[PDB]
């Protein structure tokens, strides 16, 4: 799905292949959804299968399609 690859690029602000909690928080704020660190940390932990504290593309697709 190409829409999913685009949405990943949107969230991965610095393009380094990982969505950090700070990127996620800033994007949600751009969308008008103001979230706390505790909140975006929890969303990340739910998707973070390899436990590195970030969401890579492999993790992102699993989350978006399961
Ligand atoms: C794709 N994305 C994933 C999950 N869902 C909704 C989750 C949050 N959501 C929400 C929560 C409670 C009641 C209504 C809505 S709709 C909505 C609209 C915009 C956003 C905004 F602006 F924050 F993105 C978030 C949401 C649909 C949107
Ligand atoms: C179940 N189905 C797929 C999953 N969810 C989205 C859950 C969290 N999600 C979210 C929630 C509210 C509004 C937008 C988004 S998009 C998004 C982007 C990255 C992550 C990150 F970085 F944490 F993975 C999690 C999310 C919506 C519907
Ligand atoms: O931002 C908040 O406080 C929330 O979503 O509960
Ligand atoms: Ca990044
Ligand atoms: Ca990870
Ligand atoms: Cl804070």
UniProtKB/Swiss-Prot annotation:
Which residues are recorded as binding Ca(2+) 4? Answer: 48, 50, 52, 54, 59
Q: Which family does it belong to?
A: Belongs to the calmodulin family.
Q: Where in the cell is it found?
A: Cytoplasm, Cytoskeleton, Spindle; Cytoplasm, Cytoskeleton, Spindle pole; Cytoplasm, Cytoskeleton, Microtubule organizing center, Centrosome; Cell projection, Cilium, Flagellum
Modified-residue entries (Phosphotyrosine), positions: 18, 57
Lineage per the UniProt record: Eukaryota, Metazoa, Chordata, Craniata, Vertebrata
What is this protein called in UniProt? Calmodulin-1
Biological source species: Rattus norvegicus
What does UniProt say on post-translational modification here? Ubiquitination results in a strongly decreased activity. Phosphorylation results in a decreased activity.
Positions of modified residues (Phosphoserine): 20
Tell me the subunit arrangement.
Homotetramer. Interacts with CEP97, CCP110, TTN/titin and SRY. Interacts with MYO5A and RRAD. Interacts with USP6; the interaction is calcium dependent. Interacts with CDK5RAP2. Interacts with SCN5A. Interacts with RYR1. Interacts with FCHO1. Interacts with MIP in a 1:2 stoichiometry; the interaction with the cytoplasmic domains from two MIP subunits promotes MIP water channel closure. Interacts with ORAI1; this may play a role in the regulation of ORAI1-mediated calcium transport. Interacts with SYT7. Interacts with MYO10 and MYO1C.
- Give the start-end ranges of region Necessary and sufficient for interaction with PCP4: 1-66
**What gene codes for this chain?**
Calm1
Q: Domain description from the entry?
A: The N-terminal and C-terminal lobes of CALM bind to the C-terminus of KCNQ1 in a clamp-like conformation. Binding of CALM C-terminus to KCNQ1 is calcium-independent but is essential for assembly of the structure. Binding of CALM N-terminus to KCNQ1 is calcium-dependent and regulates electrophysiological activity of the channel. The C-lobe interacts with KCNN4 channels in a calcium-independent manner, whereas the N-lobe interacts with the S4-S5 linker of KCNN4 in a calcium-dependent manner playing a role as calcium sensor and gating the channel.
What job does this protein perform? Calmodulin acts as part of a calcium signal transduction pathway by mediating the control of a large number of enzymes, ion channels, aquaporins and other proteins through calcium-binding. Calcium-binding is required for the activation of calmodulin. Among the enzymes to be stimulated by the calmodulin-calcium complex are a number of protein kinases, such as myosin light-chain kinases and calmodulin-dependent protein kinase type II (CaMK2), and phosphatases.
Further facts: This protein has four functional calcium-binding sites.
The record lists its disulfide bonds as none
Domain EF-hand: start-end pairs: 1-34, 35-66
Shown part of the complete sequence: 83 to 148 of 149
């Amino acid at each position: 799905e190409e829409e999913i690859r685009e949405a990943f690029r949107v969230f991965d602000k610095d393009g380094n292949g990982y969505i950090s909690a700070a990127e996620l928080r800033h994007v949600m704020t751009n969308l008008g959804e103001k979230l706390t660190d505790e909140e975006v940390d929890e969303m990340i932990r739910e998707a973070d299968i390899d436990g590195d504290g970030q969401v890579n593309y492999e993790e992102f697709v699993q989350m978006m399609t399961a």
